Design an enzyme around this catalytic site. Structure first.
Site, PDB file in Angstrom:
ATOM      1  N   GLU A   1       0.863  -1.250   0.017  1.00 34.74           N
ATOM      2  CA  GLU A   1       0.035  -0.178  -0.055  1.00 34.74           C
ATOM      3  C   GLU A   1       0.843   1.271   0.031  1.00 34.74           C
ATOM      4  OE1 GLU A   1      -3.557  -1.804  -0.099  1.00 34.74           O
ATOM      5  OE2 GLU A   1      -2.997   0.229  -0.341  1.00 34.74           O
TER       6      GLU A   1
ATOM      7  N   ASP B   1      -6.378   6.148  -5.513  1.00 33.81           N
ATOM      8  CA  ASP B   1      -6.247   5.119  -5.610  1.00 33.81           C
ATOM      9  C   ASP B   1      -5.720   4.757  -6.995  1.00 33.81           C
ATOM     10  OD1 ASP B   1      -8.473   2.870  -4.653  1.00 33.81           O
ATOM     11  OD2 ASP B   1      -7.708   4.823  -3.786  1.00 33.81           O
TER      12      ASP B   1
END
Length: 164
Positions: free
Chosen positions: A11, A20
């Site tokens: 991440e 994102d």
């Protein structure tokens, strides 16, 4: 290696609102704020999540707190899910980590829809399940991460993350 280090590799860490792979507004260690297109809706979620006026920016500390919550919620969600629990229970410690990573990325719902792979995982047909998992939007859209997770289910060890 553990679940937190593994996810932190996948991440990353960003202390400012960002988008994102999906274009969604996120912050910290992959904490989705909203799927809405306004930065303003995001800001608002952010301050609601943190309990302060952040003006789109957070501390390391706040990021890890959110990360602690997120991981805790992923595991608890797996535990509560009738489709997920049985698979999780059947797995060894390392593979449990790989399921948890999928859940964190895509939510309970999303993973619970991988019916056929779940089945193969329960059965311990590692090579077959790896082949089946790759046949997905998930793999096609985030191939390097999907491949790391998939190797983890195939081998049962942390080599995909050694490199990294």
């Amino acid at each position: 290696m553990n679940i937190f280090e593994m996810l932190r590799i996948d991440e990353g860490l960003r202390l400012k609102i960002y988008k994102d792979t999906e274009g969604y507004y996120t912050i910290g260690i992959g904490h989705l704020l909203t799927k809405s297109p306004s930065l303003n809706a995001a800001k608002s979620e952010l301050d609601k999540a943190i309990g302060r006026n952040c003006n789109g920016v957070i501390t390391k500390d706040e990021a890890e707190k959110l990360f602690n919550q997120d991981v805790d919620a992923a595991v608890r969600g797996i535990l509560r899910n009738a489709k997920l629990k049985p698979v999780y229970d059947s797995l060894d410690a390392v593979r449990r980590c790989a399921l948890i990573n999928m859940v964190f990325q895509m939510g309970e719902t999303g993973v619970a829809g991988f019916t056929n792979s779940l089945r193969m995982l329960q059965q311990k047909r590692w090579d077959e399940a790896a082949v089946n998992l790759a046949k997905s939007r998930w793999y096609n859209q985030t191939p390097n991460r999907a491949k790391r997770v998939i190797t983890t289910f195939r081998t049962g060890d942390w080599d995909a993350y050694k490199n990294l």
